[PDB]
Design a protein around this nucleic acid. Structure first.
Length: 690
RNA sequence: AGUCGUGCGUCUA
C-alpha cells in the first residue's frame, strides 16, 4: 500500500544517509591548527541546546556545530595525548569525485597492519622533503609540519607482493593536492576513527524520517495511562519485583513512546531491565537493548543468560544476540557473539576452486547471520554498535528499544538505535550519575553534555526507584537528603548486611571522613595532574591496619577499591601499594579513577581527594554534584573519605557534607601515621589542631 | 580544568 511504500522509503533513506557533507566539512579543517574551535567563525553561530525545537531544521542547525566542535576536540585530543605510528605512501592517480579527490596509493601490508589502518579511519598527510630517512618520525613533526591535509580511507585492496591499494578522500579545494604528484612519498599518520561520528551525523540527518521525531523535538513523554492495581500486584508477585518497580514497569510498558525510569545505583537497575524484558515478552517482537559501554552490555548478557521469569513463572531463555567484537566484549560473552554463533551453526584450476570455495563460505556466513538475526528476539549491543552495517542491510524493525544509562550518553547516541523503526522506547538513567562523556568544555558550555533523558526528566518526572538494598542507609542518607531530595527508602537489610565485621570497632564505621590537617599537592606540567603524598600515605596506613586486623579471618579478594579524581594520583597510589604490599594488591585492592570505576561496587571504597592546597579557591571536578554522587554510591559497607578540610569546606556541597558528618560524629582528624602511636609528631599535630 | 566513553576487519593468489 501507499503507507507501506512510504515507510520503506523512509527506512531506506534513514539507513542510506550520504556521508559526503560530513567529509566535506571535516576535511576542510587544518590538522596543525591549535584552537578551541575548528575554524575562526564568529562564536555567535554556536547556540545552546534548546529545550523545545520548532522544526527538525532548527534542531539540525543547532546540533551540527556542536557535533563539529566535538569532532575537532576529539581530533586534537588524539593528536596530543596519543601518538600513532607514522607511515609513508606513494601517490597515484587522482579521481575527481563530487567536491572531493580520491587518491590511490600503494602501501606495505606489514606497515598498515602495525599501524592499524581500517576502511573507516581518518589520517593526516604531509610532505617533508628535508625529513631524514633515519629520523624517528612522530606526530610532533606532523603538528609542526608546514603543510598538512586531512584524508579519509575509503577502500583497502590487497594484491600480490603484499601491496595494499588505499583510496584516500581529501577536499578538492585543499591546496595540498598540488603536492600529490605521481611517484611522490607522502608521510601519513592516523588521527582517529570516524565511524561513530559518521553514525551520529547520519542519525542527525535522518531524524526527520524517524517515527518518534515529534516526541524527540518536543521532548514531552506520552501521558501516563492508568492500569489496574490487580495486574500490577500479579506482575510483582510473578516476577518477584518491588511494588514501586513493578508499578513503574507496568506504567512504562502500557504507554507507547518514550518511557523514563530513574534508577539510582543499587536499586536493581539490571533487575528492573530484566523485569521489563520479561513483561514485554510475556505480553515475534524483537527487542533491542543498547548501552553506552561494552561493560554494561556484557553485564546485561550475563544476567539474561540465567533466564527471565514470565508471568506464569516458567523461566525461559530467548535467543540473545551480541553485536560486538570478541576482543572488546567480555570472554564469557564470546559464545553469545554473532560470529561464534554463526561458526557453530555452520559447523589455475586450483586457484579458481579456492576462490569459489571462499565465496561460498562468505555467502553461507551471510545467510547464517541473517537467519540468526531474523530468529533472534533480544539483541544487546552499544549505542554506536546498534547502527552496524549488518543490521542496516537486514532492515528489520525493532518495535521495542531499551536504552541503559540514558544519562551517560549523548542525545545523538541514544537516538542512533531508533533508526530501525523504533515505535516504543524505554530509557533508563539516573541524572545524579556521571554526565555523558564529553571531550570539549566549550561544547559542555553549550549544553552539549546534556542528554535527551535530562530534557525528558525536566519535562516530566520519571518513576524514581525509592527502594535500595546494597547501599547502606547511612551512605544513602546524605545523597537522599541533598542529591535525590528525598524519595529514597532503605530496604529491609538496613543493618543486616552480611559483611557485619569491621563495623563494631570504633575506628572503622560504615561512613567516615578522615581529613588531613596539612597536605601539599604538586602539579606536573606534562600531565597537569595534581599528586599528593599525604593522601597516599594515609590510604596505605589504613589499608595496612585493616589487613592486620583481619589478615586471616577475612579475605579481601576484590573487596577494597581506591578511587581518586585524578589519573596520576591513582597511578601513584597503585605504584606505592605494589612497592609496599607487593603482588597481593593485584586482586585484593582495585585502583581506578572515579569515572572509570563507575559500574563497579565493592565492600570498602576509599575516595581520595587530591585538592589540598588552599592557595587557589578553584575546586575543580569536585564541585560537580554528579561526580560526588557517583563516588559515594559505588560503596556498599565502608567509605573512607580522604581530603584537606579547608579545600573541601570551600565548596558549598562539600561544606554541607562536612557539616552533616560533624552532626553524625563522622569527622575524625587524621594525618601521617594516624594509627602509629610511636610517631609522637602525629599525636602532637593532632592535639594542637584540636 | 586535567579526565573519558565510543568504532573497525578477518583466504588470496
Amino acid at each position: 500500500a501507499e503507507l507501506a511504500k512510504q515507510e520503506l522509503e523512509h527506512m531506506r533513506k534513514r539507513l542510506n544517509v550520504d556521508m559526503n557533507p560530513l567529509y566535506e566539512i571535516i576535511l576542510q579543517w587544518d590538522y596543525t591548527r591549535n584552537s578551541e574551535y575548528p575554524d575562526d567563525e564568529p562564536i555567535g553561530n554556536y547556540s545552546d541546546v534548546k529545550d523545545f525545537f520548532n522544526s527538525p531544521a532548527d534542531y539540525q542547525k543547532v546540533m551540527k556545530p556542536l557535533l563539529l566542535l566535538e569532532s575537532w576536540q576529539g581530533l586534537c585530543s588524539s593528536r596530543d595525548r596519543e601518538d600513532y605510528k607514522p607511515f609513508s605512501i606513494i601517490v597515484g592517480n587522482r579521481t575527481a569525485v563530487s567536491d572531493f579527490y580520491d587518491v590511490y596509493a600503494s602501501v606495505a601490508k606489514q606497515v598498515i597492519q602495525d599501524c592499524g589502518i581500517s576502511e573507516s579511519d581518518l589520517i593526516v598527510m604531509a610532505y617533508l622533503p628535508d625529513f631524514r630517512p633515519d629520523k624517528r618520525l612522530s606526530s610532533d613533526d606532523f603538528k609542526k609540519a608546514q603543510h598538512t591535509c586531512l584524508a579519509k580511507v575509503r577502500t583497502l585492496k590487497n594484491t600480490k607482493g603484499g601491496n595494499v591499494d588505499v583510496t584516500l578522500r581529501i577536499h578538492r579545494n585543499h591546496s595540498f593536492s598540488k603536492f600529490l604528484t605521481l611517484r611522490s612519498e607522502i608521510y601519513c599518520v592516523k588521527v582517529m576513527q570516524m565511524t561513530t561520528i559518521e553514525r551520529e551525523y547520519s542519525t542527525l540527518e535522518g531524524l526527520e524520517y524517524y517515527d518518534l521525531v515529534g516526541q524527540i523535538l518536543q521532548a514531552k513523554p506520552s501521558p501516563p495511562v492508568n492500569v489496574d492495581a490487580a495486574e500490577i500486584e500479579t506482575v510483582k508477585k510473578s516476577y518477584k519485583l518491588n511494588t514501586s518497580q513493578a508499578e513503574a514497569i507496568v506504567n512504562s510498558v502500557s504507554k507507547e513512546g518514550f518511557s523514563l525510569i530513574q534508577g539510582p545505583p543499587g536499586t536493581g537497575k539490571t533487575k528492573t531491565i530484566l523485569g521489563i524484558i520479561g513483561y514485554f515478552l510475556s505480553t515475534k517482537q524483537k527487542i533491542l537493548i543498547c548501552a553506552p559501554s561494552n561493560a554494561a552490555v556484557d553485564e546485561i548478557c550475563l544476567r539474561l543468560k540465567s533466564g527471565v521469569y514470565d508471568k506464569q513463572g516458567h523461566q525461559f531463555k530467548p535467543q540473545l544476540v551480541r553485536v560486538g567484537r570478541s576482543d572488546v566484549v567480555n570472554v564469557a560473552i564470546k559464545d553469545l557473539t554473532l560470529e561464534e554463533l554463526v561458526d557453530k551453526r555452520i559447523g589455475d584450476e586450483m586457484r579458481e576452486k579456492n576462490s569459489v570455495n571462499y565465496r561460498n563460505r562468505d555467502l553461507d556466513r551471510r545467510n547464517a547471520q541473517a537467519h540468526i538475526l531474523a530468529v533472534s528476539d533480544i539483541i544487546c549491543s552499544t549505542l554506536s554498535g546498534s547502527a552496524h552495517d549488518v543490521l542496516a542491510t537486514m532492515g528489520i524493525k525493532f518495535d521495542t528499544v531499551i536504552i541503559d544509562e540514558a544519562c551517560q550518553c549523548t542525545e545523538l547516541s541514544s537516538i542512533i538505535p531508533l533508526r530501525y523503526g523504533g515505535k516504543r522506547c524505554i530509557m533508563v538513567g539516573d541524572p545524579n550519575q556521571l554526565p555523558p562523556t564529553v571531550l570539549s568544555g566549550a561544547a559542555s558550555n553549550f549544553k552539549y553534555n546534556q542528554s535527551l533523558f535530562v530534557r525528558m526528566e525536566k519535562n516530566s518526572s520519571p518513576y524514581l526507584l525509592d527502594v535500595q538494598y546494597r547501599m547502606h542507609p547511612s551512605i544513602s542518607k546524605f545523597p537522599s537528603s541533598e542529591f535525590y531530595q528525598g524519595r529514597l527508602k532503605d530496604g529491609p537489610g538496613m543493618d543486616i548486611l552480611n559483611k557485619r565485621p569491621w563495623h563494631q570497632l570504633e575506628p572503622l564505621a560504615p561512613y567516615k571522613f578522615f581529613d588531613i590537617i596539612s597536605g601539599r599537592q604538586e602539579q606536573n606540567a606534562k600531565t597537569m595532574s595534581y599528586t599528593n603524598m599525604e593522601e597516599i600515605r594515609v590510604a596505605i596506613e589504613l589499608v595496612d591496619y585493616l589487613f592486620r586486623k583481619f589478615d586471616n579471618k577475612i579475605d579481601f579478594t576484590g573487596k577494597i577499591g581506591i578511587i581518586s579524581p585524578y589519573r596520576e594520583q591513582m597511578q601513584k597510589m597503585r605504584k606505592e601499594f605494589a612497592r609496599y604490599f607487593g603482588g597481593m594488591i593485584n586482586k585484593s585492592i582495585d585502583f581506578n579513577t572515579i569515572d572509570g570505576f563507575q559500574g563497579q561496587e565493592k565492600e570498602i571504597i576509599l575516595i581520595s581527594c587530591v585538592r589540598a592546597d588552599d592557595t587557589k579557591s578553584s575546586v575543580g571536578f569536585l564541585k560537580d554534584f554528579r561526580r560526588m554522587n557517583v563516588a559515594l554510591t559505588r560503596a556498599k559497607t565502608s567509605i573512607w573519605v580522604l581530603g584537606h578540610q579547608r579545600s573541601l569546606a570551600k565548596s558549598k556541597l562539600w561544606r554541607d557534607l562536612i557539616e552533616d558528618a560533624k552532626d553524625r560524629s563522622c569527622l575524625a582528624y587524621a594525618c601521617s601515621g594516624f594509627l602509629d602511636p610511636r610517631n609522637n609528631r602525629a599525636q602532637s599535630i593532632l592535639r594542637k589542631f584540636n
